[model samples]
Target: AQNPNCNIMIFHPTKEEFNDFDKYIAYMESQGAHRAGLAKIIPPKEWKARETYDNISEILIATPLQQVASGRAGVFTQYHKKKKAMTVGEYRHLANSKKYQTPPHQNFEDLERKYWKNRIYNSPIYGADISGSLFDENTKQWNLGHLGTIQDLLEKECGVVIEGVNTPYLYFGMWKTTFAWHTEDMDLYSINYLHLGEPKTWYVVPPEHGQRLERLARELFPGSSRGCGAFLRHKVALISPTVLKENGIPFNRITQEAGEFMVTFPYGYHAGFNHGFNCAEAINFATPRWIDYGKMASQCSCGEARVTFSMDAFVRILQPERYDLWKRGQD
Candidate 1:
């Protein structure tokens, strides 16, 4: 069988379940969906969704228009591949098939063939991580950071901002934009929400296949994997579903649209491409259960250190039972 689809769970959270989202998430984890390394949460249409919030459109970011294709076919990819500033408005035109009366670039190839040029062909955008950057540059209180239990949980430990993980990072994608296959920082959970526009396609490998996936990646890129087991930190490699199946890797697939949430599990290796123009924000999160996963990974650490944040301390303090007991005693 080639590129067979794994059954990924789609949840319709009731209003109450949506209110106490953490409980519902934990419940989903218990249902064994997290084993697939991903699941989808569709907010009930009866529930009023947030008003459209704009992160801004006047921004200019780089685009590698020449090499914008699915990264699934290759073993290694490095994307410092261009030096061009593309505005969000320009990409929007490109996405909507804004064709110029005349060619925007040099050859004017379309004129000779009586063809037209599409402006929004391929691109990607948005800032990432801390201090006066992507999240800081365009701070949106409207962002649903508090909805996920991650920040509150991690804040109890670090007590400072942990950008892009427990905190949020925004993304803008035009057609053909892609994110590589990988797990979350420290191999934790992740929550991604699409604000508006077209749907994004996602692919994931279950945690059970995670170790094997890593081995496969290592074999695929022997030279790179030689010194590091955590090469995914670079976020540059993408393997296709067909390639995964070709090499005995099993995976699941899904599509995320506006107002939907995609939660990725601790060991879930996920990757995918954008359908067209769309925006998404995501954060890395963890539950008490994630503590065990970390403790074991810590024991097996080798090669260069890529610790995102200090998880050892959080692991030590994450005995939820102890806290429950203490709370009852204090009461």
Candidate 2:
């Protein structure tokens, strides 16, 4: 359950839970994946992978189906790992928010060019390198954008279940070499499926470089985005399994089945490296951080929705001492 080689963990709801799946629908709605009435409003069909991507991806659907049909949320959660959660409605709102914030006569592009041009380069964390803000606003609130457009595009074209609306999405997170090893920062809950393939090892070390990692993240993204303080502090390296074998680092190499396992990584410092394939994905379904549950339960700023913020916040809050050090990295 604990170690230092980017150890992968897998968690899956029991088959009994899957058998009595209807009850979970209410659970998903409470978490804000979609409206509760979704089951009754839209006609149900044998779910496909690319049925809903076209119109939605290009900003065509204003009010699409309220809920997706997920037999089990896990399957859908996995898909969420690689995609953004923004829907067309959400994106339009985001774009409109940008336009509204601009001076009356200025165009959206002009405002964007003026504001983001320097902000992008000023911080090493801005673009795709550090922050998800360049293309998506990484907010903890449900109303914030996600892969809604991307999902729309994917579904309309490929008929994949990117969102957990129907069929539980499975997530396979693949963090590349030297990526930040941070902990979850909220009270959220979901099964984490870690896949450590050939040449990849996850190190679950004591908070070592927490501050430096968080500092870089903050410097790169200085806003209140969900990426503020959760970083792994221990010194880590991505060596070949053969190297680990040579160094006497007793570790069990992950097999293909290990590539599809699960665990609830809430409030933990999970950091390490991968030298195998250059592709990785962490599929997840976020509830609110454990502490933020009250607000989520009350349907506050972010309507009830499930995604990554819960674990994101839980990891940070759970490690305040370490997180504080992370924040002070700027000093």
Candidate 3:
């Protein structure tokens, strides 16, 4: 394994098993299909296929899921041996090719590329805490800040649950009003919100639709399409007033006020984020943490395809006796 972090995988039981992706794969493979998908095999007792909502903290400490120990590959990963400047598409191609195309290879390489770039290039602040700035105008270099308010505001507004609010997020501000038409690792579910200005979002494209955009960017421009294989957040942010008529889905626009935008599927590719001309602060949110994903991919044998349980899936899988625990508080 290039990075031990990439190979750590585990199986757990699910209380909320709405759609059995495993059964689907089993059926396909049984039919003698050359290629078939696999379901995320959670340890029977450990997995929760159905349940109500609950507190993340408490759940982390609870049964089956808790019994689901993290794989050994994480914690001590050899990150330096990997190459940088690789785009998501490139990595996907490599993983999908004959080299590392197995259940673990594709999943591992695809997500590892995403994380490495996410952490390295998107170094917003320094020291993993909000003690600096990522970009500096006068020096044209990066500096650090201890902007406590900035830190607090992000935590309170973005609903990030990380221990340290100082760590730089894998996000870049939008300088232009372009859309992010790229897919992501399935185990990662995220919410992109606008804090100041309202950005229009169209969930028009189905989850499998953004491959072309990624490929185009790569062929046309080299380094320009580096991060996530999407053009880095230019000045304009994501905004869409009309839902392109075809889809007709109500535009789920992010208001200046902060709110939790939930993701229910592996919506990395099909989702497009656009914003009209407005001075607003937009930030993306996700859970279980990116580092945790290496384990998710490896254990699930996802093979470059990540599956995000719908928010309803979480509620259904872990329906707790106390509903209030699932509350999404502003503060």
Give the distance in Å from residue 47's predicted Cα in candidate 2 to where it truly belongs.
15
Q: Encode model 3's per-residue lDDT on 213-257: one tens digit a residue.
A: 334435434544443222422211121222223233222222222
Runs of candidate 3 exceeding 4 Å displacement: 1-176, 183-187, 194-199, 203-205, 208-213, 220-267, 270-331
Give all TM-scores, in the order shown: 0.70, 0.27, 0.24
TM-score attained by model 3: 0.24
| Order of candidate numbers by lDDT, starting with the best | 1, 2, 3
lDDT of 3 at 247: 34
For 1-331, candidate 1 gives per-residue lDDT tens digits of 2112446888898766676666887888667778788899887665533533465577654542433333323443535356366666765675567421222333322221221112124334322221112323332322355545554556554464443334566676655566777887557788887777766788898877788888888877676676555666556676766577789888878778877889998878898766557777787777867756643442213323334344434433544333343233223
Question: What does the lDDT read for residue 124 in candidate 2?
Answer: 13
Candidate models: Cα lDDT each: 0.60, 0.27, 0.26
RMSD of each: 10.1, 19.0, 23.0
